[PDB]
Design a protein around this motif. Structure first.
Motif, mmCIF file in Angstrom:
data_model
loop_
_atom_site.group_PDB
_atom_site.id
_atom_site.type_symbol
_atom_site.label_atom_id
_atom_site.label_comp_id
_atom_site.label_asym_id
_atom_site.label_seq_id
_atom_site.Cartn_x
_atom_site.Cartn_y
_atom_site.Cartn_z
ATOM 1 N N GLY A 264 18.919 13.946 -55.142
ATOM 2 C CA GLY A 264 19.557 12.651 -55.046
ATOM 3 C C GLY A 264 21.065 12.685 -54.969
ATOM 4 O O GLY A 264 21.696 11.627 -55.052
ATOM 5 N N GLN A 266 24.476 12.824 -53.236
ATOM 6 C CA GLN A 266 25.243 12.605 -52.021
ATOM 7 C C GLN A 266 26.699 12.996 -52.250
ATOM 8 O O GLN A 266 27.176 12.942 -53.388
ATOM 9 C CB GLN A 266 25.157 11.140 -51.587
ATOM 10 C CG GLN A 266 23.737 10.587 -51.542
ATOM 11 C CD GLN A 266 22.934 11.077 -50.345
ATOM 12 O OE1 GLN A 266 23.456 11.753 -49.458
ATOM 13 N NE2 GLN A 266 21.651 10.738 -50.322
ATOM 14 N N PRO A 267 27.421 13.426 -51.193
ATOM 15 C CA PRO A 267 28.812 13.878 -51.373
ATOM 16 C C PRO A 267 29.755 12.815 -51.919
ATOM 17 O O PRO A 267 29.605 11.622 -51.638
ATOM 18 C CB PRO A 267 29.219 14.301 -49.957
ATOM 19 C CG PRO A 267 27.947 14.717 -49.325
ATOM 20 C CD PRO A 267 26.918 13.754 -49.847
ATOM 21 N N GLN A 269 32.887 10.440 -52.535
ATOM 22 C CA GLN A 269 33.747 9.696 -51.627
ATOM 23 C C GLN A 269 34.897 8.984 -52.325
ATOM 24 O O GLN A 269 35.675 8.298 -51.653
ATOM 25 C CB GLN A 269 32.921 8.671 -50.839
ATOM 26 C CG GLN A 269 31.826 9.287 -49.991
ATOM 27 C CD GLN A 269 30.457 8.780 -50.371
ATOM 28 O OE1 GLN A 269 30.251 8.308 -51.487
ATOM 29 N NE2 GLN A 269 29.510 8.878 -49.448
#
Lengths: 274, 38
Positions: A264, A266-267, A269
């Motif tokens: 789950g 995500q990079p 940001q």
């Protein structure tokens, strides 16, 4: 190169000043050379050198070590073990070093021990033997330029390299560069065994113990930070034997080194991390 | 027959704050620029 140009572009300002001090007649020919080598295990290495440095007396020998600390340690060691040498390490005055190199350059015999990077910028005189006791920092530069300065303007001197039986792939490199090699063997009974005296000296003298530890650490770290990691790998080195070569019963503690992503995830940001 | 409603339980209000694209991260898709935090 292109990477050097890229580095000069990111680092320097738009207006540089380009200065050229370089010789254009580099004689890097790959045929007129002959590099001798001796295969010696780690725990006897210095002993062989000592025997060599007591048998090739009344001759001119230059010895290259990897570090300044090992040069200082071996200078004090050879002072106690009654073998006269001259030392060029970066812990002395520049005047002392220039006078010592001038005295070595105008002598009939004797041996000078120094670092390979310290004598890279040195006018090497005519010597009978150029010995590479430690692994060379720049193998291409070592082979070509140091072999040419070892051969000499007059009657040919020889360039000997000390190889352990785990760095023999260097010979394969010498096979690829088409450089003729010469193998030097030594009898086992002609090695002057001063190992017990060396260990007693290291165990009883506090200054020599400190110098031995510093030289051992410097050798391990310079071997770790090597350009040719395939030929010279610290992980293939037996630390007990090389510390016995430095004069230790037990090897002092050194640091040789110094899947799946999350479910789950995500990079990132946003946010600040310090 | 008809039916009437009698209230049971949870009476609660949901002020929207943000709607993301990822599972618990990823880019922000909806951001409520009205929210006044407690």
């Amino acid at each position: 190169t292109t990477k050097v140009e890229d580095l000069a572009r990111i680092s320097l300002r738009p207006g540089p000043l380009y200065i050229n001090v370089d010789e254009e007649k580099k004689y890097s020919t790959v045929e007129g050379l002959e590099q001798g080598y001796v295969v010696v295990e780690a725990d006897k290495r210095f002993l062989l050198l000592f025997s060599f440095l007591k048998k090739m007396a009344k001759k001119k020998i230059i010895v290259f070590f990897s570090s300044c600390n090992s040069v200082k340690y071996y200078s004090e060691l050879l002072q106690y073990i009654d073998l006269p040498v001259l030392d060029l390490h970066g812990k002395q005055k520049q005047q002392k070093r220039t006078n010592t190199f001038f005295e070595f350059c105008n002598a009939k015999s004797g041996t000078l021990i120094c670092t390979d990077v310290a004598a890279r910028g040195l006018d090497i005189p005519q010597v009978d033997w150029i010995v590479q006791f430690d692994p060379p920092d720049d193998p291409r530069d070592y082979i070509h330029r140091v072999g040419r300065t070892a051969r000499g303007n007059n009657g040919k001197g020889r360039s000997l390299l000390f190889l352990q039986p785990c760095e023999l792939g260097f010979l394969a490199h010498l096979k690829a560069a088409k450089v003729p090699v010469v193998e030097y063997d030594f009898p086992k009974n002609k090695i002057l065994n001063v190992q017990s005296q060396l260990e007693k000296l290291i165990s009883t003298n506090y200054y020599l113990n400190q110098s031995a530890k510093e030289g051992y650490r410097s050798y391990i770290h310079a071997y770790a930070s090597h350009s040719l990691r395939s030929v010279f790998d610290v992980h293939k080195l037996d630390l007990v034997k090389v510390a016995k070569s430095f004069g230790f019963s037990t090897p002092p503690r050194v640091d040789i080194t110094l899947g799946r992503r999350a479910y789950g995830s995500q990079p990132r940001q946003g946010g600040r991390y310090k | 027959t008809d039916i009437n409603l009698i209230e049971i339980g949870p009476r609660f209000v949901l002020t929207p704050i943000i709607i993301q694209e990822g599972s618990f991260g990823g880019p922000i898709l909806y951001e409520n620029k009205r929210f006044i935090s407690p």
